[PDB]
Paper text:
Bromodomains (BRDs) are protein interaction modules that specifically recognize ε-N-lysine acetylation motifs, a key event in the reading process of epigenetic marks. The 61 BRDs in the human genome cluster into eight families based on structure/sequence similarity. Despite large sequence variations, all BRD modules share a conserved fold that comprises a left-handed bundle of four α helices (αZ, αA, αB, αC), linked by loop regions of variable length (ZA and BC loops), which line the Kac binding site and determine binding specificity. The four helices form a deep cavity that is extended by the two loop regions (ZA and BC loops), creating a largely hydrophobic Kac binding pocket.
Cocrystal structures with peptides have demonstrated that Kac is recognized by a central deep hydrophobic cavity, where it is anchored by a hydrogen bond to an asparagine residue present in most BRDs (Owen et al., 2000). An asparagine residue that anchors Kac by formation of a critical hydrogen bond initiates the BC loop. Indeed, ITC experiments showed that the binding affinity of many BRDs was significantly increased for multiply modified peptides. For example, the KD of CREBBP decreased from 733 μM for H3K14ac to 131 μM for H3pS10K14acK18ac suggesting that many BRDs recognize a pattern of modifications rather than a single Kac mark.
Residue numbers in the entry: 1083 to 1197
Amino acid sequence: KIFKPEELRQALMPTLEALYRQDPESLPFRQPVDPQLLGIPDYFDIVKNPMDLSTIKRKLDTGQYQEPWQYVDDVWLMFNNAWLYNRKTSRVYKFCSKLAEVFEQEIDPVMQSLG
């Protein structure tokens, strides 16, 4: 019913690690999209709620998720931003799809264990 922050973090962290461990597929996701540096000023017109692995880890590390679904929501947010913004055959889009494949395989038992 109520989750202890360090147990939530401990349960969920392996699924985040699984994504980080994807090389090269995690690489575009390990840090926030910076549209200024990238010269893509349209990015925040399309992606209103940016999300990336570094931000997810920080939130997981600083008790910012009270329930497991808020974490799942952020991972899906990351994916959905990338699938909306990028070409289907782009490196980023293909990479994202791999992260989603890994995440689907990792999350389901963890959500089962958590209740």
